[PDB]
Amino acid sequence: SLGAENSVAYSNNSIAIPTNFTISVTTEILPVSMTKTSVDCTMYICGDSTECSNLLLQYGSFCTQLNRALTGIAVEQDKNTQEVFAQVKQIYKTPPIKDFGGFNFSQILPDPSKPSKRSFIEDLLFNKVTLADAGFDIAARDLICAQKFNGLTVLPPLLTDEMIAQYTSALLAGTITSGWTFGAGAALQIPFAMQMAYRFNGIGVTQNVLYENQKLIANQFNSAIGKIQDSLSSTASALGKLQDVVNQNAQALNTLVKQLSSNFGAISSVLNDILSRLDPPEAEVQIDRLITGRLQSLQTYVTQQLIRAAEIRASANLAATKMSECVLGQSKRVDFCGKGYHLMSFPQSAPHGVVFLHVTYVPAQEKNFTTAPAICHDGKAHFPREGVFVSNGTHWFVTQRNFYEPQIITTDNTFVSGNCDVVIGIVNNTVY
């Protein structure tokens, strides 16, 4: 089934206006980078074999091309992480006193106690992600081993997880202390309640709504953050994208390593065995068969890595755009920064990726009102300045569109244009 059947109660004089709202926080995960991998083509093909390397020299610069491609991929991974996270010229720090109008960012702000200054949710994500073989990470010595020992090496990322967490903390502090001003210039302090009032104005809801429902809105935000924490703690499929990227990379590396056991038509898949049994002239044929097979395997691996790196670069560009347009500002683009009317977004660092906590405004409780496009008062047609005309059955009011706040229709809520005999659906009513 595609979903529950619904039939909107559409009428030519009926409107539904929400009377309440819910503050929804939803998580979005985006891969930002993949493990750097450098492969010594000569070692992989002809590990410790001068004759095999001399034979390989007859193939030109294939090894140089492959090494160049992989180096480009690694540098591009560093560039992806830099572009996504280094969006703040200053490392903003949140004040010691967390007087944010009732909103509670404890679970996303850094935890000084931990050796890594990561938030609760960031630690949850880092624990949730599992790698595969080895990400040498917490390695105090050489790299993994089996893969590491066949001419394949993994280069550490330029920015450590601590540095990524520092960037995320700077972004979060800048947001919660200065709204969107730090993304356009010097961060301009503003009380968080007033910042949220600005956001409500941005989504077209009057700020008095927030100032009158501040406690409820703060409670809803805190509950949503707690729900996100609980979901991350319980479920394990949330980070499927990052896990899939890691698994794809590990599987490609495993296939490349396993291809070293293929005879490719040679007497044996062991270069030492071939060289220790045959004389130079006849051994060249077997060595050439092995060289051809292993070179084809390496070329296939490098092409797959290039395609995957292009995909990851597209994802990282999307993540950088999301950071700029949701964390550093309020986005009017629908469904870009989450579902509902976007209010604000919070970044969280994840292994080889980023997690966005999109805070959105969702209308909750919608009522039945009769509506008219204009009001006839004294032979003149009155239209609402900002809002819509509604009726509860007997009296007519003008209300903002996203929240039922009925008000008396006056000459200040409306403007005049023309007369009564043009607008289709105009209704008679006094304008005070």
Partner 1 sequence: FTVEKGIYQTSNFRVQPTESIVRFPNITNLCPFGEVFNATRFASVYAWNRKRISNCVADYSVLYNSASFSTFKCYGVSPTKLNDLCFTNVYADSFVIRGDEVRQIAPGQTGKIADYNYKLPDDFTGCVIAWNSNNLDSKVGGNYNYLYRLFRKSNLKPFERDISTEIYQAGSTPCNGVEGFNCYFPLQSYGFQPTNGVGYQPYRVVVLSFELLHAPATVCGPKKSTNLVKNKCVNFNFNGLTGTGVLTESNKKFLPFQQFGRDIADTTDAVRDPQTLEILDITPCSFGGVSVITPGTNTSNQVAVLYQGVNCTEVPTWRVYSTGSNVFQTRAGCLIGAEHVNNSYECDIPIGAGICASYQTQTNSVASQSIIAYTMSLGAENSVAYSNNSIAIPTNFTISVTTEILPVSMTKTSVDCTMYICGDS
Ligand X SMILES: *[C@@H]1O[C@H](CO)[C@@H](O[C@@H]2O[C@H](CO)[C@@H](O)[C@H](O)[C@H]2NC(C)=O)[C@H](O)[C@H]1NC(C)=O
Ligand Y SMILES: *[C@@H]1O[C@H](CO[C@@H]2O[C@@H](C)[C@@H](O)[C@@H](O)[C@@H]2O)[C@@H](O)[C@H](O)[C@H]1NC(C)=O
Ligand Z SMILES: *[C@@H]1O[C@H](CO)[C@@H](O[C@@H]2O[C@H](CO)[C@@H](O[C@@H]3O[C@H](CO)[C@@H](O)[C@H](O)[C@@H]3O)[C@H](O)[C@H]2NC(C)=O)[C@H](O)[C@H]1NC(C)=O
Ligand U SMILES: *[C@@H]1O[C@H](CO)[C@@H](O[C@@H]2O[C@H](CO)[C@@H](O[C@H]3O[C@H](CO[C@H]4O[C@H](CO)[C@@H](O)[C@H](O)[C@@H]4O)[C@@H](O)[C@H](O)[C@@H]3O)[C@H](O)[C@H]2NC(C)=O)[C@H](O)[C@H]1NC(C)=O
Of residues 337, 144, 328, the one with CA closest to residue 250: 144
Output the smallest distance, CB 411 to partner 1, in A.
23
Distance CA 137, CA 114 (A): 16
Which partner in ligand Z, a copy of itself, partner 1, none is near 235 (CB below 5 to 8 A by kind)? none
- Report the chain's C-alpha Rg in angstroms: 31
Residue 276 found at the interface with ligand X (CB under 6 A): no
- Among 7, 4, 71, 81, smallest CA distance to 38 is for 71
Piece of 174-182, 214-222, 238-246, 308-316 that binds ligand Z (CB under 6 A) = 214-222
Phi, psi at 105, each rounded to 5°: -110, 30
Q: Does the protein bind ligand Y through residue 93 (CB under 6 A)?
A: no
Token pair listed for 330: 């309020």
In the complex, minimum distance from the CB of residue 3 to partner 1, in angstroms, rounded to a whole number: 41
Burial of 150 (0-12, 13-18, 19+ CB in 10 A): middle
Q: What is the distance between the alpha carbons of residues 23 and 362, in angstroms, rounded to a whole number?
A: 6
Q: Which of residues 365-384 bind ligand X (CB under 6 A)?
A: 368, 370
Among 22, 365, 358, 18, which Cα is nearest to 223's?
Answer: 22
Is 334 among the residues that bind a copy of itself (CB under 8 A)?
yes
Backbone φ and ψ for 91, nearest 5 degrees, come out as: -90, 85
Phi and psi at residue 170, to the nearest 5°:
-60, -45
Whether 52 contacts 135, CB under 8 Å: no
Residue 3 is a binding residue for ligand U (CB under 6 A): no
Give the x/- contact pattern for partner 1 in 24-53, rule: CB under 8 A. Answer: --------------x-x--x----x-----
The interface with partner 1 within residues 137-156 (CB under 8 A) comprises 141-143, 145-150, 153, 155-156
Which of ligand X, ligand Y, partner 1, none has residue 14 at its interface (CB below 5 to 8 Å by kind)?
Answer: ligand X
Question: By CB under 6 A, is residue 140 in contact with ligand Z?
Answer: yes
| One character per residue 352-391, x = contact with ligand Y (rule: CB under 6 A) | ---------------xx-----------------------
Q: Any bridge partners for residue 408, and if so which?
A: 397
Residue number, 7 or 394, with CB nearest to ligand Z: 394
- Per-residue string for binding with ligand Z, 97-126, x by CB under 6 A? -x-----x-xx-------------------
Residues 24, 33, 49, 331: which binds a copy of itself (CB under 8 A)?
A: 331
Place of tokens 């709504």: 209
Residues 117 and 170 sit within 8 Å (Cβ to Cβ): no
Site for ligand U, rule CB under 6 A? 392-395
Site for ligand Z, rule CB under 6 A? 20, 22, 98, 104, 106-107, 140-141, 216, 219-220, 364, 376, 392-395, 427-428
